[PDB]
Short mmCIF file of N, CA, C and O in Angstrom, two decimals:
data_model
loop_
_atom_site.label_atom_id
_atom_site.label_comp_id
_atom_site.label_asym_id
_atom_site.label_seq_id
_atom_site.Cartn_x
_atom_site.Cartn_y
_atom_site.Cartn_z
N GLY A 1 14.97 223.80 79.65
CA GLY A 1 14.07 224.35 80.62
C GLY A 1 12.80 224.90 80.16
O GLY A 1 12.02 225.35 80.96
N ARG A 2 12.73 225.30 78.74
CA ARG A 2 11.61 225.50 78.03
C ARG A 2 11.07 224.48 77.35
O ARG A 2 10.35 224.66 76.31
N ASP A 3 11.44 223.21 77.79
CA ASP A 3 11.01 222.06 76.90
C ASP A 3 9.54 221.74 77.22
O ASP A 3 8.98 222.05 78.21
N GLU A 4 8.76 221.55 75.99
CA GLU A 4 7.17 221.17 76.07
C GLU A 4 7.08 219.80 76.65
O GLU A 4 7.44 218.90 76.10
N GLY A 5 6.30 220.03 77.85
CA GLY A 5 6.29 218.70 78.76
C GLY A 5 7.58 218.16 79.52
O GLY A 5 7.26 216.93 79.92
N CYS A 6 8.79 218.78 79.30
CA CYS A 6 9.92 218.21 79.92
C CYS A 6 10.15 216.89 79.50
O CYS A 6 10.88 216.07 80.27
N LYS A 7 10.11 216.78 78.32
CA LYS A 7 10.59 215.50 77.67
C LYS A 7 11.91 215.24 77.31
O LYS A 7 12.60 214.37 77.91
N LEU A 8 12.65 216.29 76.49
CA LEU A 8 13.79 216.21 76.18
C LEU A 8 14.76 216.40 77.34
O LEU A 8 14.89 217.70 77.53
N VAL A 9 15.47 215.64 78.03
CA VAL A 9 16.37 215.81 79.10
C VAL A 9 17.62 215.07 78.80
O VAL A 9 17.64 214.18 78.39
N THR A 10 18.89 215.81 78.92
CA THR A 10 20.11 215.18 78.79
C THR A 10 20.35 214.32 79.71
O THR A 10 19.73 214.11 80.82
N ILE A 11 21.47 213.43 79.65
CA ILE A 11 21.97 212.60 80.42
C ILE A 11 23.19 213.10 81.16
O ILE A 11 24.26 213.49 80.59
N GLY A 12 23.08 213.15 82.50
CA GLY A 12 24.27 213.87 83.20
C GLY A 12 24.52 215.14 83.09
O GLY A 12 23.20 215.59 82.69
N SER A 13 25.49 215.74 83.82
CA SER A 13 25.56 217.29 83.75
C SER A 13 27.04 217.47 83.42
O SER A 13 27.58 218.58 84.01
N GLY A 14 27.50 216.85 82.35
CA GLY A 14 28.87 217.21 81.95
C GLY A 14 30.02 216.40 82.70
O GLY A 14 30.90 216.91 83.08
N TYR A 15 29.92 214.96 82.88
CA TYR A 15 30.67 214.23 83.74
C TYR A 15 31.66 213.62 82.73
O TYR A 15 32.89 213.54 82.91
N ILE A 16 31.35 212.93 81.51
CA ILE A 16 32.01 212.19 80.80
C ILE A 16 32.20 212.84 79.41
O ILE A 16 32.37 212.44 78.41
N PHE A 17 32.16 214.27 79.43
CA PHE A 17 32.10 215.36 78.39
C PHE A 17 33.46 216.07 78.40
O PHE A 17 34.53 215.93 79.16
N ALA A 18 33.52 217.22 77.54
CA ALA A 18 34.81 217.85 77.18
C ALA A 18 34.89 218.74 78.49
O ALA A 18 35.91 219.05 78.96
N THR A 19 33.75 219.62 78.99
CA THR A 19 33.54 220.58 79.85
C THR A 19 34.47 221.69 79.63
O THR A 19 35.50 221.89 80.43
N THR A 20 34.30 222.33 78.64
CA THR A 20 34.94 223.58 78.55
C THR A 20 34.32 224.85 78.74
O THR A 20 33.44 224.71 79.56
N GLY A 21 34.89 225.99 78.45
CA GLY A 21 34.16 227.19 78.83
C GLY A 21 34.28 228.23 77.48
O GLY A 21 34.91 227.96 76.79
N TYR A 22 33.57 229.39 77.92
CA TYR A 22 33.43 230.42 76.74
C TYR A 22 34.29 231.76 77.22
O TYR A 22 34.26 232.13 78.52
N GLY A 23 35.13 232.25 76.10
CA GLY A 23 35.90 233.59 76.56
C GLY A 23 35.73 234.40 75.34
O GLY A 23 34.94 234.53 74.54
N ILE A 24 36.75 235.44 75.37
CA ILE A 24 36.74 236.50 74.26
C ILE A 24 38.11 236.24 73.65
O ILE A 24 39.20 236.46 74.27
N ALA A 25 38.07 236.05 72.36
CA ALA A 25 39.26 235.84 71.69
C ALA A 25 39.78 237.10 71.12
O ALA A 25 38.94 237.92 70.32
N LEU A 26 40.86 237.73 71.68
CA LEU A 26 41.51 238.75 71.39
C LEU A 26 42.55 238.66 70.51
O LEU A 26 43.01 237.38 70.37
N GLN A 27 43.16 239.66 69.79
CA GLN A 27 44.34 239.43 69.02
C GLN A 27 45.74 239.31 69.93
O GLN A 27 45.82 239.64 70.86
N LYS A 28 46.45 238.56 69.20
CA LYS A 28 47.90 238.06 69.77
C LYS A 28 48.76 239.41 70.12
O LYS A 28 49.41 239.61 69.21
N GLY A 29 48.51 240.10 71.16
CA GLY A 29 49.27 241.29 71.38
C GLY A 29 48.29 242.48 71.48
O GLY A 29 48.91 243.51 71.43
N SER A 30 47.01 242.12 72.03
CA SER A 30 46.03 243.39 72.08
C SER A 30 46.39 244.02 73.33
O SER A 30 46.48 243.38 74.54
N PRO A 31 46.00 245.31 73.44
CA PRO A 31 46.18 246.24 74.71
C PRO A 31 45.21 246.19 75.68
O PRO A 31 44.96 246.53 76.66
N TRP A 32 44.00 245.24 75.50
CA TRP A 32 42.96 245.43 76.18
C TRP A 32 42.83 244.19 76.89
O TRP A 32 41.72 243.94 77.66
N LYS A 33 43.72 243.28 77.14
CA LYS A 33 43.54 241.80 77.63
C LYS A 33 43.44 241.90 79.12
O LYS A 33 42.44 241.34 79.67
N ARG A 34 44.30 242.71 79.77
CA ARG A 34 44.30 242.84 81.21
C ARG A 34 43.01 243.46 81.78
O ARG A 34 42.60 242.92 82.67
N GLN A 35 42.43 244.68 81.12
CA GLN A 35 41.21 245.22 81.76
C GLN A 35 39.94 244.38 81.50
O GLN A 35 39.05 244.23 82.17
N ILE A 36 39.94 243.61 80.19
CA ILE A 36 38.97 242.51 80.09
C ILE A 36 38.94 241.42 81.13
O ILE A 36 37.93 241.19 81.56
N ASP A 37 40.14 241.15 81.35
CA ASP A 37 40.41 239.93 82.49
C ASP A 37 39.99 240.57 83.82
O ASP A 37 39.07 239.81 84.35
N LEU A 38 40.26 241.52 84.22
CA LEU A 38 39.91 241.99 85.53
C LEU A 38 38.54 242.69 85.43
O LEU A 38 37.88 242.31 86.49
N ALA A 39 37.91 243.00 84.40
CA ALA A 39 36.58 243.16 84.42
C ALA A 39 35.66 242.03 84.53
O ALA A 39 34.74 241.87 85.15
N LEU A 40 36.25 240.94 84.02
CA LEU A 40 35.55 239.57 83.95
C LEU A 40 35.67 239.10 85.58
O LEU A 40 34.54 238.49 86.17
N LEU A 41 36.66 239.26 86.06
CA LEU A 41 36.71 238.57 87.36
C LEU A 41 36.06 239.62 88.43
O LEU A 41 35.59 239.29 89.69
N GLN A 42 35.74 240.81 87.98
CA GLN A 42 34.98 241.70 88.75
C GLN A 42 33.41 241.36 88.64
O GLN A 42 32.81 241.49 89.66
N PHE A 43 33.14 240.96 87.38
CA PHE A 43 31.69 240.82 87.19
C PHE A 43 31.45 239.46 88.00
O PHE A 43 30.16 239.27 88.51
N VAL A 44 32.20 238.38 87.95
CA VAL A 44 32.13 237.16 88.62
C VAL A 44 32.12 237.78 90.35
O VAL A 44 31.49 236.96 91.11
N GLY A 45 32.99 238.33 90.58
CA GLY A 45 33.44 238.67 91.91
C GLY A 45 32.69 239.19 92.91
O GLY A 45 32.76 239.69 94.02
N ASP A 46 31.28 239.86 92.29
CA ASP A 46 30.35 240.48 93.10
C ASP A 46 28.73 239.88 92.85
O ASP A 46 27.87 240.45 93.29
N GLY A 47 28.78 238.83 92.11
CA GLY A 47 27.30 238.18 91.91
C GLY A 47 26.68 238.88 90.85
O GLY A 47 25.51 238.56 90.35
N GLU A 48 27.38 239.62 90.05
CA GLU A 48 26.85 240.16 88.79
C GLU A 48 26.54 238.93 87.76
O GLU A 48 25.47 239.06 87.12
N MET A 49 27.58 238.22 87.74
CA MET A 49 27.61 237.24 86.60
C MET A 49 26.65 236.16 87.18
O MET A 49 26.00 235.51 86.37
N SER B 1 62.46 253.59 77.77
CA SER B 1 61.42 253.42 76.72
C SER B 1 61.95 252.86 75.39
O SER B 1 61.47 251.85 75.05
N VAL B 2 63.17 253.45 75.08
CA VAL B 2 63.93 252.84 74.08
C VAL B 2 64.40 251.61 74.44
O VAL B 2 64.52 250.56 73.43
N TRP B 3 64.97 251.23 75.68
CA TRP B 3 65.18 250.02 75.78
C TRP B 3 64.07 249.07 76.06
O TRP B 3 64.18 247.83 75.59
N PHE B 4 62.78 249.56 76.32
CA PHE B 4 61.59 248.72 76.11
C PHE B 4 61.48 248.52 74.53
O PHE B 4 60.95 247.38 74.14
N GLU B 5 61.87 249.36 73.64
CA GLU B 5 61.90 249.23 72.30
C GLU B 5 63.10 248.24 71.62
O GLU B 5 62.76 247.58 70.73
N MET B 6 63.98 248.08 72.66
CA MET B 6 64.91 247.17 72.56
C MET B 6 64.32 245.79 72.74
O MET B 6 64.63 244.61 72.27
N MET B 7 63.33 245.88 73.70
CA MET B 7 62.67 244.58 73.86
C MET B 7 61.72 244.19 72.92
O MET B 7 61.17 242.96 72.49
N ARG B 8 61.37 245.21 71.98
CA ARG B 8 60.72 244.81 70.75
C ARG B 8 61.65 244.49 69.61
O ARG B 8 61.43 244.08 68.40
N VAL B 9 62.94 244.94 69.80
CA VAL B 9 63.96 244.54 68.60
C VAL B 9 64.20 243.01 68.58
O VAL B 9 64.14 242.16 67.55
N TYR B 10 64.77 242.56 69.74
CA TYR B 10 65.40 241.10 69.88
C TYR B 10 64.33 240.14 70.42
O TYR B 10 64.46 239.25 70.80
N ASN B 11 62.93 240.78 70.77
CA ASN B 11 62.07 240.13 71.17
C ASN B 11 62.28 239.58 72.58
O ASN B 11 61.89 238.23 72.93
N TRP B 12 63.05 240.06 73.44
CA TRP B 12 63.23 239.74 74.79
C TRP B 12 62.43 240.14 75.91
O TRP B 12 61.61 241.06 75.73
N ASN B 13 62.25 239.34 76.78
CA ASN B 13 61.29 239.45 77.93
C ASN B 13 61.86 239.50 79.36
O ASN B 13 61.30 240.16 80.23
N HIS B 14 62.80 238.75 79.47
CA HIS B 14 63.44 238.63 80.96
C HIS B 14 64.50 239.72 81.06
O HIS B 14 65.43 239.66 80.43
N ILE B 15 64.11 240.62 81.95
CA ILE B 15 64.97 241.67 82.34
C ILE B 15 65.10 241.73 83.99
O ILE B 15 64.29 241.55 84.79
N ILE B 16 66.27 242.51 84.32
CA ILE B 16 66.69 242.73 85.67
C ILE B 16 67.01 244.10 85.79
O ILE B 16 67.62 244.79 85.04
N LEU B 17 66.17 244.66 86.75
CA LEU B 17 66.30 246.41 86.90
C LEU B 17 67.38 246.43 88.02
O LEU B 17 67.38 245.87 89.30
N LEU B 18 68.43 247.13 87.58
CA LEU B 18 69.68 247.60 88.45
C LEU B 18 69.73 249.07 88.64
O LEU B 18 70.44 249.70 87.76
N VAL B 19 69.39 249.95 89.46
CA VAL B 19 69.54 251.25 89.60
C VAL B 19 70.47 251.67 90.99
O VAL B 19 70.00 251.17 91.89
N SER B 20 71.55 252.34 90.74
CA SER B 20 72.41 252.78 91.95
C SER B 20 71.67 253.94 92.49
O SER B 20 71.68 254.05 93.83
N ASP B 21 71.20 254.86 91.87
CA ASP B 21 70.38 256.02 92.24
C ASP B 21 69.24 255.83 92.93
O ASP B 21 68.80 254.56 93.01
N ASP B 22 68.61 256.82 93.73
CA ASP B 22 67.35 256.54 94.50
C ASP B 22 66.28 257.59 93.98
O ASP B 22 65.18 257.37 93.92
N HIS B 23 66.87 258.93 93.64
CA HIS B 23 65.52 259.85 93.23
C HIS B 23 64.95 259.68 92.02
O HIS B 23 63.90 259.33 91.71
N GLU B 24 65.62 259.40 90.75
CA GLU B 24 65.26 259.27 89.44
C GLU B 24 64.93 257.68 89.25
O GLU B 24 64.29 257.35 88.36
N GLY B 25 65.50 256.71 90.16
CA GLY B 25 65.35 255.46 90.04
C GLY B 25 63.82 254.96 90.33
O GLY B 25 63.38 254.17 89.59
N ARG B 26 63.05 255.64 91.05
CA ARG B 26 61.74 255.31 91.36
C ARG B 26 60.85 255.92 90.15
O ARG B 26 59.78 254.90 89.71
N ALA B 27 61.09 256.92 89.56
CA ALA B 27 60.35 257.47 88.42
C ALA B 27 60.74 256.40 87.20
O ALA B 27 59.80 256.13 86.46
N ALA B 28 61.93 255.83 87.14
CA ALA B 28 62.23 255.05 86.07
C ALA B 28 61.74 253.78 86.33
O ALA B 28 61.39 253.10 85.23
N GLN B 29 61.54 253.21 87.74
CA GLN B 29 60.77 252.13 87.72
C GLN B 29 59.32 252.11 87.60
O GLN B 29 58.85 251.19 86.93
N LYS B 30 58.86 253.35 87.89
CA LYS B 30 57.40 253.44 87.61
C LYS B 30 57.08 253.56 86.16
O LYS B 30 56.09 253.07 85.52
N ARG B 31 58.04 254.10 85.31
CA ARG B 31 57.84 254.23 83.93
C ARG B 31 58.07 252.89 83.32
O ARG B 31 57.29 252.38 82.36
N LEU B 32 59.17 251.98 83.77
CA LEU B 32 59.47 250.40 83.25
C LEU B 32 58.29 249.78 83.33
O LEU B 32 57.83 248.98 82.73
N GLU B 33 57.44 249.87 84.51
CA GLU B 33 56.48 249.26 85.15
C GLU B 33 55.26 249.39 84.26
O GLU B 33 54.31 248.59 83.75
N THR B 34 55.09 250.79 83.96
CA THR B 34 53.81 251.23 83.14
C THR B 34 54.03 250.82 81.62
O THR B 34 53.10 250.40 80.92
N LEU B 35 55.43 250.64 81.14
CA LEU B 35 55.48 250.04 79.73
C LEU B 35 55.29 248.59 79.81
O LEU B 35 54.88 247.99 78.67
N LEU B 36 55.97 248.01 80.76
CA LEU B 36 55.55 246.50 80.91
C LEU B 36 54.17 246.09 81.10
O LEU B 36 53.66 244.83 81.05
N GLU B 37 53.34 247.11 81.74
CA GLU B 37 51.81 246.70 81.74
C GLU B 37 51.30 246.42 80.27
O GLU B 37 50.35 245.70 80.28
N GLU B 38 51.98 247.09 79.40
CA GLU B 38 51.27 246.85 77.89
C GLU B 38 51.67 245.30 77.42
O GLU B 38 50.79 245.00 76.76
N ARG B 39 52.85 244.73 77.85
CA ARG B 39 53.12 243.47 77.44
C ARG B 39 52.49 242.70 78.74
O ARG B 39 52.44 241.28 78.41
N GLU B 40 51.82 243.25 79.71
CA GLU B 40 51.34 242.59 80.91
C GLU B 40 52.44 241.71 81.35
O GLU B 40 52.12 240.70 81.98
N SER B 41 53.61 242.35 81.63
CA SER B 41 54.59 241.59 82.28
C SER B 41 55.48 242.41 83.30
O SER B 41 55.09 243.58 83.50
N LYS B 42 56.42 241.76 84.07
CA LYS B 42 57.07 242.67 84.83
C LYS B 42 58.45 242.10 84.89
O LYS B 42 58.74 240.93 84.27
N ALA B 43 59.34 242.77 85.56
CA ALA B 43 60.80 242.44 85.57
C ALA B 43 60.99 241.41 86.81
O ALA B 43 60.23 241.01 87.53
N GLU B 44 62.08 240.70 86.45
CA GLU B 44 62.34 239.62 87.52
C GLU B 44 62.61 240.42 89.03
O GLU B 44 62.13 239.55 89.99
N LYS B 45 63.53 241.15 88.96
CA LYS B 45 63.88 241.57 90.33
C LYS B 45 64.52 243.15 90.04
O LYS B 45 65.32 243.31 89.17
N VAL B 46 64.02 243.82 91.00
CA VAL B 46 64.23 245.28 90.88
C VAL B 46 65.39 245.54 92.10
O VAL B 46 65.23 244.85 93.11
N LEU B 47 66.24 246.46 91.88
CA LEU B 47 67.32 246.83 92.83
C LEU B 47 67.71 248.16 93.00
O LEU B 47 68.02 248.92 92.09
N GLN B 48 67.63 248.91 94.07
CA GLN B 48 68.10 250.17 94.45
C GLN B 48 68.78 250.19 95.60
O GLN B 48 68.53 249.49 96.64
N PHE B 49 70.03 251.00 95.77
CA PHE B 49 70.72 250.84 96.90
C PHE B 49 71.35 252.45 97.14
O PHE B 49 70.90 253.24 96.40
N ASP B 50 72.44 252.57 98.06
CA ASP B 50 73.06 253.79 98.16
C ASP B 50 73.95 254.17 97.10
O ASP B 50 75.03 253.34 97.04
#
């Protein structure tokens, strides 16, 4: 999107690729997992994301 | 809570709540759900009767 002259353009949009996502890696047993998950669902759930 | 600590002893997760009483049983169920919120879990089935 900031390419000089719009030269470098990828092929496709993630069709024959891995197509993963990004998250927050908490410790196995952390007491903040539920609040972080509900906060992310609230952030996506109102157009803030 | 000690029984929740028993769930820390044997690493058990699948529990069934059975309370014959009604007055203290609601507070015991609320405390058990508050403690299972830490594991982000719930009991399989809760039971109260006469």
